[PDB]
Amino acid sequence: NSFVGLRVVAKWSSNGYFYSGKITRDVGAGKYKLLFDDGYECDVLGKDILLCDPIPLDTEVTALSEDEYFSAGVVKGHRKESGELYYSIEKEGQRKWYKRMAVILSLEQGNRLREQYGLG
Amino acid sequence: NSFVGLRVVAKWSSNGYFYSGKITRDVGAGKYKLLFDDGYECDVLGKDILLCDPIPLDTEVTALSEDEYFSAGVVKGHRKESGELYYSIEKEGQRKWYKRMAVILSLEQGNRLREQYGLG
Numbered sequence: 379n380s381f382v383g384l385r386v387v388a389k390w391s392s393n394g395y396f397y398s399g400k401i402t403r404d405v406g407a408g409k410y411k412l413l414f415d416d417g418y419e420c421d422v423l424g425k426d427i428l429l430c431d432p433i434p435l436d437t438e439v440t441a442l443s444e445d446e447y448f449s450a451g452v453v454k455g456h457r458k459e460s461g462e463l464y465y466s467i468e469k470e471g472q473r474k475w476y477k478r479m480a481v482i483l484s485l486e487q488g489n490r491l492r493e494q495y496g497l498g
Numbered sequence: 499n500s501f502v503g504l505r506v507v508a509k510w511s512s513n514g515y516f517y518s519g520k521i522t523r524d525v526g527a528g529k530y531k532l533l534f535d536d537g538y539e540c541d542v543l544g545k546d547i548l549l550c551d552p553i554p555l556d557t558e559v560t561a562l563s564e565d566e567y568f569s570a571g572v573v574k575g576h577r578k579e580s581g582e583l584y585y586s587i588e589k590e591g592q593r594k595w596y597k598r599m600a601v602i603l604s605l606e607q608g609n610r611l612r613e614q615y616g617l618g
Contacts (some may be wrong), residue, residue: 456555
C-alpha cells in the first residue's frame with residue numbers, strides 16, 4: 379500500500395540536489411508532497427524521489443561540513459545510535475562520521491540511483 | 499533490465515531460512531537459479547527471494563556463532579572493509595560484529611521483508 383510516511387531522498391528543484399525527507403501526501407498523477415527534514419515542503423515528481431533509507435553502501439555522496447564546505451565521499455558504513463542514523467563517509471582513504479542531515483546527493487549522484495530506487 | 503547477477507537473500511526450501519546468494523539465471527515463469535554463497539545451487543521462486551544487499555538496519559536476523567549456536571539479534575550497523583560486508587548485531591543491548599555468511603533469516607524474519615523486498 380501507500381507511499382505516505384515513507385522516508386526518502388528527494389530532489390529539490392531549484393538546485394538539483396536530493397535531500398532527506400518524508401512523503402506526506404500523494405498529490406496524484408505521479409506527484410507527491412514532501413516534508414524535508416529541514417521543514418521545507420514542496421511537491422515533487424515521483425521520478426525525482428529515491429526510495430533509499432539509508433543511502434546505500436558504496437554510493438558516492440556529498441558531505442557537509444559545519445562551516446559550509448562540501449565534498450564528495452563514498453559511503454562505507456551505516457550506524458544506528460539512540461534512534462538516529464549516522465554515515466561513515468570515506469574521502470581520500472579516510473573515514474569520517476556524518477549525521478543524516480549532513481549527507482546529500484548532487485544531481486549526478488542522485489540520478490545514478492534512479493533506476494534502482496526511483497519512484498518514477 | 500535483468501535480475502541476473504544481483505545479490506539477494508533467498509529461501510532454502512528444506513529448512514525455511516533465507517541465505518545470501520546470487521541470481522545466476524532466470525529460469526522463467528517466476529523462477530530463478532540461485533548460487534548461494536556456500537556454493538549450493540537450486541531454483542527458487544521469485545517470491546522467496548529478497549532483494550536486500552545488505553539486510554536492512556533495524557531488521558531482526560539470525561546470527562551464527564562458530565561453534566554452531568544461533569540466536570536472534572537486531573541489525574544496528576553495516577560496515578565495508580576490504581570489499582567485504584560486516585554486520586553489527588545487537589543482542590541484549592550488546593553489539594557484536596558478524597561476517598556476511600554468519601547472518602541469515604528465519605522463516606518468520608525473511609517473511610517480514612517480503613512486501614518491501616520480495617521478487618514475488
